[PDB]
């Protein structure tokens, strides 16, 4: 099992969700986040850029496809398009049923 | 060391916190999120290898309503852990 | 490739950003989060900072964040490392070190 | 027209919404807020209502948000001098 | 002096900001908010509709024009388009200078 | 009764709260909000500036004092220091007791 995490521009969220759903990939968690001076006495960084974090739990066999869908859909060519990364999931449980591993995907 | 992450219904949060505290599990970070809007909370716990499966079972059994939307719980390996205040590492940082 | 995640007090944020930037490390993500009546009342505002980093720089980045986020008082938080199995730059599709 | 604003404990939100719905009042907006390095989460509820119904709406929110302990919050009324429904361009009472 | 408040769909936000700018109106505030069941131990509304609250401080002379710009720019013709309202401002202060009234706009 | 609303830089919040407390003014609600290049994606503003909205319900007799405390504390002299404004409160109720008006302050 893999976790795919993507930090992307907020206005791409709808397009990413639709592209995954047409690939049969449903299930996604979205969190608002920020990437990147003024003195007030300390120093404060003043300008933030809004992003969304998209998290998809996925089978090993579909991990690469999900990455490519998000990359291709989130891309605008301009700078700040963001990053996608993969981490390993060692255990997975569906709360409702208690199914584990593949059965929980 | 393991990271336990759960996406659960917001109204289960206090019950999960209480269930974990009686198991001696202290630290917990809580982030508002949403999924497929439906508001959820992400709960994250850093736990020893020996207690990690117990923590998963506590969260699963306490977050369960039997209805759709109950969420998922997963485990990620932690390769290094440092407690900021002391600089202790590994098991000593837990 | 490594992900460094830290839960720290909100007022350390600029000091951490500057200290990372000083070490040539850019690109951090910041998320508001929190730690800890019948019908929990109090919450403690925290920030989660995440930094994608090469294996060669991972320990240095951990050390910068730990030293920069420390107050000596309870609640200072924790810093941890997870392994990244694939990194992609959205703009180019580049992987690995070319995506840093 | 009146704006009714209330700062209330988050777990009373659905009960207030249902009590207002039974009174025929629809269209509330809900914003996370916090009040008084340690905050207590509250929700701000805002309702736009006719002059004739405004005091009833205050009573519903007060009675449904009350727990009898500290933190129950406050409810207040602001005068609305003009109101427009975006979809139709209706104004005043027709926008309610 | 007036406060104009509007609850509108989030994708109209840039169009509204642009139309206000074209009219020489700047200084809007934007707040994420929600419009509108599961029982647990009791009742809980299950889902929400994302909205944005927009607030603009405006002279009396320009208040109707600003209302009309926001209404025409936020409109889609679909349900959920929101509402725009005006409240009276009894004192306005610019923090930097302490200037009141028209000097604070 | 009056409502004092202030849009100020987030790093001034603690100093404003302490200044209001040492003046005997208790009770405040704080909301995260944003003020305002342009990116096209098919038009989207991207650079947001974080602010906090502070709201204080106050008696008529202390309204001016509260405005001046917030203004003087939130001021840094730089641009973006924000604005403070006053609106009239026609009715006020303390939820816990049902006290009204002055008794609810
Ligand atoms: N594959 C996934 N990846 C990331 N998050 C997920 C995934 N599946 C579910 N979630 C999270 O868990 C919550 C509950 O999911 P689930 O119960 O499967 O949703 P539904 O009620 O639509 O069946 C979702 O709101 C989502 O945030
Ligand atoms: N004077 C005030 N101005 C603004 N908000 C207030 C005021 N008094 C109370 N509140 C809000 O109501 C919440 C509950 O306060 P209380 O009911 O007085 O314990 C606070 O945390 C604030 O969010
Ligand atoms: P477009 O289809 O007009 O917008 C779709 C979604 O994009 C988000 N979003 C709106 N406005 C911004 C801005 N200024 N910056 C980042 N993301 C934005 C959602 O709010 C909107 O529904
Ligand atoms: P119960 O004691 O009422 O739950 C308390 C907590 O539940 C969360 N929550 C409240 N209301 C909702 C709704 N409508 N939807 C999802 N989660 C909810 C917290 O807000 C509250 O503190
Ligand atoms: P200072 O006393 O270091 O911080 C006080 C509070 O100000 C907020 N804040 C922290 N960091 C920022 C930045 N970069 N920009 C705006 N506001 C900031 C709180 O987070 C902090 O506790």
DSSP assignment string, A69-98: HHHHHH--SSTT--EEEEEE-SEEEETTT-
Report d(CA E92, CA F67) in Å as an integer: 10
Backbone angles phi, psi at E20, to 5 degrees: -65, -45
Resolution value (Å, 1 decimal)? 1.8
Backbone angles phi, psi at A88, to 5 degrees: -85, 140
> Which-ligand-closest: CA of D6?
2
Residue of A nearest to F13 (CA): A40
| Chain E environment of B65 (Cβ under 8 Å) | 38, 40
Contact B73, B3 (CB under 8 A): no
CA-based Rg of chain D, rounded to a whole angstrom?
A: 14
Report d(CA E25, CA D30) in Å as an integer: 27
| Chain C environment of D69 (Cβ under 8 Å) | 37
- Residue of C55, C58, C56, C48 whose CA lies nearest to C20: C58
8 Å CB contact of D62 and F93: yes
Q: At what angle do helices B52-63 and B13-22 cross, to 10 degrees?
A: 150
Report d(CA E74, CA E52) in Å as an integer: 11
Angle at alpha carbon of residue F103, lines to F99 and F105, rounded to 5°: 105
Determine the distance from the C-alpha atom of residue E47 to the mean position of all C-alpha atoms in its chain, rounded to a whole number.
Answer: 23
List all residues 6 or more positions away from E12 whose beta carbon is below 8 Å from its beta carbon.
E73, E74, E76
Q: Which residues of A4-23 are buried (b: 16+ CB within 10 A; e: fewer)?
A: bbbbbbbbbbeebbebbeee
Q: Ligand 5: does its nearest atom lie under 6 Å from the Cβ of C45?
A: no
Contact C17, A45 (CB under 8 A): yes
Q: How close is the Cα of D33 to the center of ligand 5, in Å?
A: 18
Give B9's DSSP letter: -
CA-based Rg of chain E, rounded to a whole angstrom?
A: 17
Report d(CA B42, CA A32) in Å as an integer: 13
Chain E interface with F: residues with Cβ < 8 Å: 1, 3, 13-14, 17, 26-31, 57, 87-96, 98, 104
Which of F17, F25, F29, F90 is best to mutate for the D interface (most D CBs within 10 A)?
Answer: F29
Give C73's DSSP letter: S
Chain B interface with C: residues with Cβ < 8 Å: 1, 3, 13-14, 17, 27-31, 46, 76-85, 87, 93
Contact D5, D55 (CB under 8 A): no
Q: How far is CA F94 from CA D3, D16, D67, D79, in A?
A: 17, 16, 12, 19
According to DSSP, the β-strands at E38-39 and D29-35 are: unpaired
Neighboring chains of F (3 or more beta-carbon pairs < 8 A): A, D, E
- Residue of E7, E27, E14, E23 whose CA lies nearest to E61: E23
- Residues of the binding site of D for AMP: 29, 48, 71, 73
Report d(CA C29, CA A44) in Å as an integer: 16
Report d(CA A65, CA A42) in Å as an integer: 46
- Residues of the binding site of F for ADP: 28-29, 57, 80
Q: How close is the Cα of B72 to the center of ligand 1, in Å?
A: 7
Q: At what angle do helices E13-22 and E60-74 cross, to 10 degrees?
A: 140
| Chain D environment of F87 (Cβ under 8 Å) | 78
B67 closest CB neighbour out of E38, E41, E50: E38
What is the CB neighbour count within 10 angstroms for residue A78?
A: 12
Q: How close is the Cα of A94 to the center of ligand 1, in Å?
A: 9
D37 min Cα distance to partner chain C (Å): 7
- Residue of C35, C84, A48 whose CA lies nearest to B28: C35
Contact E25, E2 (CB under 8 A): no
Report d(CA A67, CA B43) in Å as an integer: 25
């Amino acid at each position: 099992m893999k976790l795919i995490t993507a930090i992307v521009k907020p206005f791409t969220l709808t397009d990413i969700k639709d592209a995954l759903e047409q690939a049969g990939v449903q299930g996604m968690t979205v969190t608002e986040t920020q990437g990147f001076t003024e003195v007030y006495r300390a120093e404060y960084a003043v300008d933030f850029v809004p992003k969304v974090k998209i998290e998809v739990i996925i089978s090993d066999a579909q991990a690469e496809e999900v990455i490519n869908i998000i990359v291709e859909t989130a891309r605008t060519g301009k700078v700040g398009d963001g990053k996608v990364w993969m981490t390993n999931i060692e255990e997975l449980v569906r709360v409702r049923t208690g199914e584990r591993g593949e059965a929980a995907l």
